[model samples]
Structure formats: structure tokens, C-alpha cells
Target: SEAWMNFYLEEFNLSIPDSGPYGITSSEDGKVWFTQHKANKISSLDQSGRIKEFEVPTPDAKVMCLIVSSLGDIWFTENGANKIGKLSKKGGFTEYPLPQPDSGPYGITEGLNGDIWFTQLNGDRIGKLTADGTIYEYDLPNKGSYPAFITLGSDNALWFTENQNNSIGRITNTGKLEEYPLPTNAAAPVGITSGNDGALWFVEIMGNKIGRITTTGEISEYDIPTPNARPHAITAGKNSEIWFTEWGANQIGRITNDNTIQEYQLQTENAEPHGITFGKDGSVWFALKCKIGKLNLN
Candidate 1:
């Protein structure tokens, strides 16, 4: 399609010979960074498409999600190996092991105050890491909530989704936490983001719905037409629409604030689109199965 042909990253190249790409983040300087899950390395692609890969210090660390800090450092989660990693702009790497075994650090985001927040998918906790690598952990009220994805909300509070408990949680900068249960039992809230409308938008992986929650704890949900779509990651688009990936159904879905949904089918079946983010050029970019895809708004 003409949209795919235009605004594609012509310069960036994947360094790993053949590995699945997980999470991706772009820097202010047009450098694109992503995690190579199977390769167990962090990669960066410059504006010219030159690729650079950095190996984590911890052996067997499975890098999952990634985010660029205000200081230009790349921070990422090691889900399978139970570690969080930091990669310097100059290619240096540091590994910080989680406090609990098999924490399965999943989604990560940079907080307003410059701290890094992440979800512990297996350990069922939230993790905060300071600039100097000081680790602070907070346990959820329930034992098996399985916090999966996280984002910084409009109120400057850290909001996250509980995939196992079917709830949403918010933690203020000072560490106060409040969790709200979803109306539908076991909705399996998975991916969440601070939407352009100033509310928290998330995907219900099990319920096959999109949900919105306000700062005051009001919740609204809209069911998708496709059943068992298994929406995974969500991001606010340049057009003020919510864009999400359907892991189970193999499609890309978009929803407006008014609750209208539009889906785009993948050329390859079961592509499993994952992490998504808007680029500097205002294009919607996302990871498709193992490849990177871009949709031009123009």
C-alpha cells in the first residue's frame, strides 16, 4: 500500500541475523532502539540505518520492553532472565537484577520525575529504579495480580494493567497506590497508555475489549467486533485515535474516543503486532511479529 511505502525507516537495519524484535523506542535525535528477544541483545539504529547491537552483562537475560530516558540512556526489561538493563548512548551496558527471583520485568516507562517504572509480570509487583540504580519495589494488594504493562498518566501518576487480576492500578510519584477492579470479571487487562484524551486507555486481552479509566476511578469499556482478538499493546496515534495490536487475531485495531473501532488486517497471517509508538515524523510505528511497520498519517 502507498501508506506503507512512504515514511518507512529507510536507514535502520536489524543487526541480529534472524531474531524476533520485541520492544522499540526512538530517541530525540532520530535514533531507533529495540530489543532482540531471541538474540538476547539491545539494538540501536541510527538515522542512516546503521545498526548497533549491545549484549547485556547478565547471561540468559531475555530483553522484553525498552524506553529511552531523558538523559539519552536506553532502559529495558529482562523478562525471562529476571533483570533490568541500562545501555549507555556510547554502547556501555549495565545489568540490575530484580529483588525477587523470576520477577519477569515486562513493560517499562520513564516517569515525569526522571525515575524509571516497570511491571513485574511474574513477581506481581511494581519496580522503581533511580538514576543511580537504586531499586525500590512495591507489592500489589493481591498475590497474583501479574502486573504486565505500565505508562505515565496525565496526572503524573504511574498507571499499569494487571493481566491476571483483571484490574488497573495507579501509583503516584510518592508511591501511593490505588487499584480499581474492572467491571467484567477476569477481563485480563494487558496493555495500557495515557491517551490523548487525558485518560488511561487499555486493552482487555481476555475480554476482547478496549477500556478507559479516569483519574477518579470511573471506568468505561467498548467491546471489539472480533471475538478473542487478544489485544496486546496500545498507543495514542497522531490522529488522536487509540491504536492497538491484536495478538490472538493477527490484526491492527484503532479506536476513537467515541468508541468507534477500525481494524487493519496484516498481510502475513498471525504477525502478532506488539509494541507501538509514534515517531518523530508523526507516523505510527509498531513491531509486527518480528518486523517493524510504519503507517503514514499523510
Candidate 2:
């Protein structure tokens, strides 16, 4: 019966194309949006699970990550094409190519100043783009740092992970950058996000731990009982709980602010869970290897 839960979506024939369903974000109007990494498209689902897709003008763009801005627009990264894109609520689209070729644009988030911030996974830099398409790039201090995921920190700074360097880094709104080493060397920190408690939370894919770093740069880590679980994307949840995806272990894990940990096996084995977020309804919503999933909290 447990196995049946994992294959539940298969019954609907809801398989996605290669490299994605990567990043997902919810709109204020209650719609869910996601990227088709290899398909070069941005897709949407309404409250009732109805689907809509909008294609990017660039072929094989490899749309990898996304975030919904306060202006009611969908902002995303094109990993293969080295560009950032914006799609209006009405479905109009625009693309801004990165100044550097093959930058591997990865994670993206909305800044407090209404601009969009993102990581260049292959280029070892962070980028800030204004609504009008002005771009500012900041090169990391280290080479091949591979800054994978990013989020706005409680201190109004931008926090991100150095996947290859196994470090956590922060950049203030003024462009000042600071980096801290993780407790375990080569932890391979992947995804990161701001917690409700005003701290930055992240995942250690190789270390199998959930990490928290305060705005003042204090770091704390909690081990997952399952070894080599490869915890990936993470997000803040209601009630001070931090939720994350276990990409390799095929599970969803949660850690309360008080340090209590819980792991819920994914409905499907090897679902390759990726980006995750808390829905307006308070349920946990995440992307499996090719499909979106919802976990009821109540």
C-alpha cells in the first residue's frame, strides 16, 4: 500500500520532460508556476490542477529555476541559454541574455528592493537584475564556487550556497559579501531559503544534514537519521518548521525551530524531489523528478 502512494501520479500519466520540473513558485492569486528544465517552457497549474504552458523564445533554453515577483510576474533562469526571463501575468514574455556566455543561471529570488537576484552556477558569480532589465554581476571570491541556490536573508542580505566549495555565503543589499565554512568539509550544500524565525536554512546533500545560519553568521546543523540521504531544496514552513527535499533518499523532511526532525518518505521511490515551498493552504508543495506533489499538513 505504501508503494501505491508513490505511483499515484503515474495513474494520471503526468510525466515531465528532461531536467525538470526544477524550480516552482506560487502566485499571490493562488496559481502555481514551474519550469520545464529541458523543455524550454514555463508551466502553470491552477488551484484545481489545470495546466498551462508558455514556451520561451530560445530553443533548448534549459529553464532551470524560478521565483514569482511581487509585481505579479514570473521570473526565471535559463541555465543553458545564459539568460534571465520574465513572463507577465497575462502571458507576455521577455528574455535578457547574461553578459557572460554559458553562465548556467540557476537559483533566483525576489529582492526586497523589487529587483531579481540569481546565481550563475557555472560562472562563479551572483547577478542582480532590475525590473527594467539592467544587470549587475558580482563575481565570487573563489573560482568554480558553483553558487547553486539563493534566498533573501532576514538581515535583508542575500544568502546562498557554494555547492562545489561546500560553503555558505551572504551578500548584503549593498553588494558586500561574506562566506562561512560548513561544519563538515565537502558537505555539498545545495538549496537554501529563509526560515520563518528570520534565519537562513539550507541542505547538505553529501553531509545529510539540515543547516541553519543566523543573520549574524552563527551556524547550526542537525543530522538526518538516514545516511547519504542527499537533502536538497529547502523552504520555510508555517509554525516555525523548516521543510526540505531529500533528492536521493526519496523523502520529504521537516525540522521544527526547536530542532525536532521528521522525515516522510516520498510517495514514489526515487522521485528525485527538487524545489519546494509552503502553499497558501499551509500544505507542503514540491516537485518530484517530473511531477508536482502536495502534502497535506492538517
Candidate 3:
């Protein structure tokens, strides 16, 4: 009990001042990277407990989601600046301007072929950026669908959430697209992650449920006990379980592949937990209260 209590520190928080840590990811190295959206910077936390932040070249760029690239670099979106940015490991940056003005680029993930793909919050399109910096885009069939988060599924395709349309969207490496409507209305699915159980699990922000969709187009929903907890982002937990943030309820929840659910309360004032990821040490890390929070899986 003493070791468990020490492992799950209730006040495990690191101050980042005004850097709104939105999206977060861990690399192969003993470092974690995340976007400070409001601060327009990307911050890295090393194993030695040191924090380093690099300001994005574009002012008010609103750097959003970030992922460690296949080449050991970090890639992110400038949602407010209509740009995609690549931050090299050497602390240098390379920026790419989108063809569509005010396209509102949001979520991003590396494709199966080592290319980069992102969503245009308003353009209703998926923009692809290669290592060579050349980009191509594919339009979604549903206009004004308002797709938000994205993930690489077990099928080797890109799966995303169509927030406005209340549907799940997918695209192949060749850019072929498909949309699957949800069982509930106003689902507004947000953050998503591929589950180890060979299915893609997601959270419905408005519908108040955990959703899972197979690669073959089948979908299922599990209702949450806390009505309208306003679950936000989700990531696979270390122990064959999946975890999510209950933004409205100030809690973090976990679910097993069997659909069993458990939740942990965050006793912070107005705590809004967002991105969640497994760190190099197998502990769960997340963004909340303008700081980074860590959770011990055991």
C-alpha cells in the first residue's frame, strides 16, 4: 500500500504557466512531447525531469496536436495559422503552408508509408504531407462534416471522427474514403486511439459513451455511468485496457476490452483532462489544469 500510494501521487503536477498542453505523445527515447496551443510552443520533458519549450516560428500559430515522427522529429499543426510544422530533433523547424487559406488544420498522424496526414477543420479535406514536403489533399464526401481527431487503425488506414456529422470517417493510403454513422445522435466523437484488441476505440463527447469500431465498419457503444461527463481524448492504457478523460466531471476513466469501466477522480479545480498517452516508463500521462499529470497504471 505504501508503494502504491507513492506511485499514484495525487498532486503529481508540473506547472507550465500559460502553455495549454493540448495534444501529447511519447517517443522511443525517455522523453515526452506535447503542444502548448495557447502558448504557441512545443515542450519536451526529459527523463531527468527537465522541461524545454521551443516557440513556434509562426506567431499565434495555435500549435495543436503533436506526434513523434518516424524520423525522430516532431510534427504538429498550426491550427490558427493554416500550417503544418516539423520540429527536428536538433531544435530546428520546417514549416509548410497549406494551399487553402483558413482551412483550420487540426489533428495529424503519420501515415503507414511514413508520410504525414492532417485534417482541415473547415476545408472538409485531409491533407497529406510527405517527407519531401510535397502535399496532396482528398476531399471528404460530406460537406461541413467537421472532422476532428485522427488515428492509425489496425487495418493500416487512417480513422477519424466527423464531429458535426456524428459519424466515423476513414481513408486508405490511396485516399479512398468511407463514413459510418453512429448509433446515437449528437455523438460528437472527439479524441481516438487504436486499441490493442484489433479495434478502434473512441469517446463520444455529446452522446456520453465509449465507442468501438472494427476495421470492417461494425460499431458498438458503451454508456457511461456519469451522464454527460463530457469525455474528451482517449488512449490505450498499458495493461490491455483503454483510458479516457472526463472533461466535464474532472476525472480519468479506464476501460477493459471486455467493456468494463473504472474511473479515477482528479481533485483539481476546474480540471479538464485532455490528451492521454503512455510514457516510456509505462505510466499514463495527460494534460490538465495548464500542467502535465501522470498516472501509475498499477
Candidate 4:
């Protein structure tokens, strides 16, 4: 019961107020990149506590989720402007407008071939941005699916959550789509990541649970213990555990491969923790309201 004390979280306040540090990812070299949804900028934090900010080229782009490409570029989605933006290591900005207006692109991941994959919460579509600057869009079988977060599975396909439809979806690189309905109604699955256990782990915001889906479409879920936690983004831990943000509960959660669950309270109340990823140094980093937190397991 006292094991939670072993987890130590250090909060690093952002330079700007209402930064809304939402989506987060890490580079191979250990730098952290994240989107400032309310601030409308992209920022990075180094291990030395130095913070750098880059303004989005489009006003009120409502930058959402981001991923560091294999080539060291920071690629993110613009929810408000319906575009995909890329930031070079040197801070240059490049924007790719979605073919459809108001697509509301959200989650993003790097495909097996280094292509950029993203979900459209408003458009109910999955998008691909190829290396040569070509874009492709694929629609889901249901309207109002509200696809949110996405991750590349070990099976060489991309998997995502359909927030409105309460199901998990997998799409092949060739645009083949398959859907698996959740056992729990209105689960509202959100952040997803492929785990070292060879399963895709995800968080259910509404149902208050953590979900795992095998590449072959088998689904299993574990209760989060906190009622209406509104669990958000999920990522695989360095030690084979799965970590997630309880956006509503203001806590970070960990679940081992064998399904044991633990929650660590945040130092700040109403932190609204969101995107999570592992730093190169083995610390778990997450974006929260107006600040970013890093967890060091003692």
C-alpha cells in the first residue's frame, strides 16, 4: 500500500501562464517536445531545466499531439486550423493543410516506413503524410466515431481509439480498416501505446479503466480504481509497465504487464496531466496544466 511513495515527481513550471502543456513526446537525444494548446506554441524542455518555445505559424492553430520523427523533426497536429505542422531541429515551421476543413487532427505516430500517421477527431478519418509530402485520408465505417489518439502496433499497422464509437480500430498501411467494439459501453478510449508485452494498452476516460488489445483484436480491460478518473494518454514504461495520465483525477497511474494497478498523486492539485512518454534517461515525463512533470522511480 505504501509503494506509491517510491515514485517521486518533480514539477517544472512553464515560463508562460496557461501554457496548457497537452501533447508530449521525447527525442532520441532525451529532449522533450510538447504542444501548448492554449498558449498556441510548441516547446521543449532539456534535462538542465531550460525551456524553449516556438510559436506556431498559424494563429490559434490549437496544436494538439506531437511525435518526434526518426529524422529528428517534431511533427504535430493543429486541431483548430485543420493542419499538420512540422518543426525542424533548428525551429523552422512547416504546415500541411488538411484536404478537409475542420478535420480537427489529434493523435499522431510515426509509421513503419517513417511516414506520419494522425487521427482526425472531427473528420472521423485517419491521415498519412508521406516523406515526399503526399497526404492520404481514410474514413471509418461509422460517422461520429471521433477518433482520438493513435499508436503504431508491433504488427506493423496503426491502431487508434474511436472516442464516440467506444471501439478500437486498426488500419493497415494500405488503408484496410478493422474495428473492435469494447466490452464496456461508452468507454471513450483515449491515449494508446504499444506495450513491451506485445499488446496495445490504452486508457478509457469515461469508463475509468485501462484497456489492452492484442494485435489479433482480443480485448481486455482493468478497472482504474479511481471513479471517473478520465484517464488520458498512455505510454509504455522503460521497465515493462504501462503508464497513463488521469486527467480528471490529477494523478499518474502505472500498471504492470500482469495487470496490477497503482496510482500516484500529483504534487499539484488540478494538474490535469495529459501526454506521457519516457525520457532517454529512464524518467517518465508528462505534460500538464501550465507545467510539465517528470517522475523518477526511486
Candidate 5:
């Protein structure tokens, strides 16, 4: 067991005092922020590795993924609490309640006009919030769609997953909505990210495949070698490829431009890898077992 624990036993494996980190992102200046899912906090890490925590005003808000704007503003969701929260760099938290009860907002992103966009997993809708505290919500065409993670796309619109409906949904800044059915049913798509090749890439948690959809609605998917890999969240790799987590396989998987798949096994079993993002310094960061680890692609 000594050897099992000795790997990656370094200062970078900073712990969060019972807080489960789900989403992580870094500012261009190198400041990192993430959602503390259970601890009711949205926390941050600086260039010098100093960590800070900000408590969400809504208790038990079930905070999920987060995004930091160019102005250092933090926005996140309350999956159970039915609200969107904004944390300022120097101040306390401001909460905006979604009109629908238990909408289950789980993902957040910045839109073209600097407004924040998010998905409502249970509410079957998408929402937008401007910096001034005004908010707007748009309903998806299908109920029980269970929309999950969301990201800004190459076409200046917001793209996300319909976990229950097995499709990818797109929403323009003006709130126009469209859905493209995946090639595989029961795909249960989750994380989404804009790719380097002028397309959007997503992961199917149930279908066990990496999916791609262009702005114009073309779709393609590649199978993962591991059975039931349970690919969760996805992000663009610094190497201009696609990266995602194998929650069931307990490994990190990468898909090259040509759809070539490679996986790196994690030493720990049942790591339950969740959200992943690319650091500005060409490093890959993923969250697992309550610690954030960096994978050096160099």
C-alpha cells in the first residue's frame, strides 16, 4: 500500500476539506477556480498555488461546473437549489433563482455578449444571465430531456447535451434552440467543448463514445475501446485534440484528430473522474478523488 499511496504524493494534490470539486477553469492570467459541489463553496487557486474559498449564499445549492469571465467574475449553478450564483472577486455571493422549481442547472459558460449561459438538467431548459443581474430562461422542445453540461461553440452559440433525449442541443445568444439527434441512441451525452477543427465534441456516458457535431448540424461518433467507459465530461486538449474521463474504466482518454483513441490508466481504482479542462500553460487538469491532478502532455 505504501507504493500505491506514494505516487503523486506532492504539494499539488491539495485537499479541499470535504469539498468535492466538480468544475475547474483558469483565467488567462493563471488564476484557477472550481465548484466545490458538496461544501457549498466556489473556490480558487492562484498562480502561486494559494487557494481561497467563497461560500455560496444558498445553502445546499448543489453547485456544479463554474466559469470565470475576463473580468474575474465567477458564475455557477445550483442543481438542487434551483438558482444561478455569481461571486465577485472582492465581494460576497449573489443568487438568482430560476423560475422553475428544481430546474437542476448543472453547467455554465460565457456567451458572446458577456452574459452567462447555463443548462437546466431537470427543468429541460437553458438560461442566460447578464452581468447586471437580469436573467432569462428558454424552454427546450422536449420535456424530461435532462440537459446536462454546456459550452460555447465555434459558431458563436451555446452547445450542450441532452442526457435523456440522446441529442446535442444548440442555443444562440438570442435564445434560439435546436437539437441534433446523435447517431447512437441512449447515448446519454454529458460534457461538451468546442473543438479546434471548427466543430463541437461531446461524450456519451451510456453509449461509450466520443461524439462530434458541427455548427451546421452534421454528426459523427467514435467508439471507446473500453466497454462502458462511461465517458463523463470533455474538454479541448492543448494539442488540438479531444480529452475526456473514463469514469468506469478509471483512465483518462484522448482522441486524436483522426479519431485515434489513447488511454492512460490511473493507479487508483474507482477514481470516478469528473470534469476536465485545459490549462493555458499547455497542461491538462482533471478532478478525481477530491484532488485536482495535472497531466503533462509535453
Candidate 6:
């Protein structure tokens, strides 16, 4: 029995090859959404495994992370266009420009109060999009923090990873902010998600570790079993497990609440897994170089 055989793996190729599938997420309806970094488009995968593509209105927008809002509308960041976009389930698009030009908005998630929160990778700030479509930006303490991803924590605050400063940051609904430095220098934390254990979990692309930070700012690190795996995105699993993608090793890794990690390699070499999410159907879905992969959690 091969190691890969222990876990079930399936791949669905994109109709457009080499479209650079970078950010992936799922809605409560069991539909998966993803962004094409180079293709300037957003695509969806239905429950029946059908693929549909929608073009972003802005040419060369460099679309990035996407999330389905509480209202079931799709929201994403256009890094190149410096705007946040919303797409209705009925196929309508509305883009809101950021206050700062070249803000390079990246990660996005809904807050506890139904507002949308996001990170400004180049702007060195956090942003909130209210239900009424208003945008508010909060500046980080340092100029080069480069906040990468944002997620709603158990404490009802928005937590983000500072990729350049090697710290975890928390911002309250009232616009208060704080940062906790990582134990390892140059961690380059990227993806983040609220874990089932009531802590925030993130991946270190450069430090090569999985990190856990509590809502109160305590931090811990778990080394990836594979050296230089370059772990990318992470998300909470159905159980107490947290799943992530190893970009350099072409594998998906899972870490239990106890901090134990188990890695499953992709059968195909150079899959370049970037994002991972536990879907509504209880399967783990990820974005690869040119395709999307799913792992049945059974």
C-alpha cells in the first residue's frame, strides 16, 4: 500500500490550461470558488464537478483571494486594480476602489458583525467593507508589515498575518490593532484560518512552519516534517484538524489540534498546491498549478 493510496485524491483540470489557479474557497452551497492570478478571471466548481468561468471586468486586474459572503455573494480582491469586487449569485459585478492607490488588497473574510474585512498587502493596513458598501482602512503600526491574510477569530476580532514583519496581528471591530511577533525570524506567514481549537492557524512560507496564535496573542510554531515545504494556505477541518498546502513539495498537509502533522503527496509532480479549504461537502479542496484537487475526508 503506497502512502498516497492511504488518502484518496482526485483532480479536475481547468478548461484553460496554465491559468494559474492561486486562491480557492468554498460556499455553504457546496460550490467551490477560485481565482486565476494570470488569467484575470474567477471560476467556480459546482457539486456535480462542473466548471464555469467568469471574466473580471478590469483587464489585467491580477485577481487574488475570494470568499463567499453571508449573503451568498462572491467577493474578491483585485490586486492590480487596487479594488475589491463583489459578484452576485445572479452574475452581477460591483467593484469598490480602495482609498489608497496601489493598496494591493489580498485576503478577505466576513467579520462577526456581517462586515467584510481584508488585508492590504502593500498598503500596510487593514480594510473593512461595511454592509452598506462603505470602505474603512486601518493603518498598521509599521510601514512594511505587508499583512497577507485575514480571518475572523473565535474572539470576534479579525486576525491577519504580517508577511514581512513575521508577526500575527489582531484588529477589533472598533478599529483597534495589535501585533504579536513570531518566535522564528523571517517567518513570512501567508495563509490564515480560525481553527476548531479556538486559535488562529497560519503557514510560514519562508520559515517553513505551521503557526498557532491564540486570540489573546500567545503564539506557537510546529515545524513541517518535510524541510523547505513552503507551506502556503491553511483552513480548519471538520474535526480538530487543520489542513494546508505545501507549495514546494506538492502535497497537502494536516495538523491536528495537538500540533501533529501528516502529509499526503500528490500523485502528479509539480502540482504546486497553493490554497486549501474544507468544503461544505466535508471534502478538502485545493487549487493546483492548473487544476483543482479534492480529498474526501472519510
Candidate whose lDDT is highest: 4
For model 4, name the residue pairs that clash.
none
Report, for all candidates in order, the number of backbone clashes: 2, 2, 0, 0, 0, 0
- lDDT tens digits, residues 82-170, model 4? 99999987779999999998899998999977799999999999999998889999999899999999999999899999999999999
Task: Give lDDT tens digits, candidate 5, residues 135-204.
Answer: 7889998899998888888889999999998899998976788899898878899889999887999999
Worst 10 residues of 4 by lDDT: 1-10
lDDT of 3 by residue, 68-113 (tens): 9878899999999999999997889989999989999998998866
Question: Where does candidate 1 have its weakest 10-residue lDDT segment?
Answer: 4-13
- CA lDDT of 44 in candidate 6? 92
User: TM-scores across all candidates?
Assistant: 0.90, 0.93, 0.94, 0.97, 0.92, 0.96
- Tell me the lDDT of candidate 3: 0.85
Candidate 5 stretches greater than 4 Å from native: 1-11, 14-17
TM-score winner among the candidates? 4
lDDT of 1: 0.81
Report the lDDT of model 6 for residue 211: 93
Greater-TM-score candidate between 4 and 6: 4
Question: Candidate 6: which stretches are off by over 4 Å?
Answer: 1-5, 257-259
Pairwise lDDT winner, candidates 3 and 6: 6
Residue-level error in angstroms, candidate 1, position 261: 1.4
RMSD of 6: 1.5
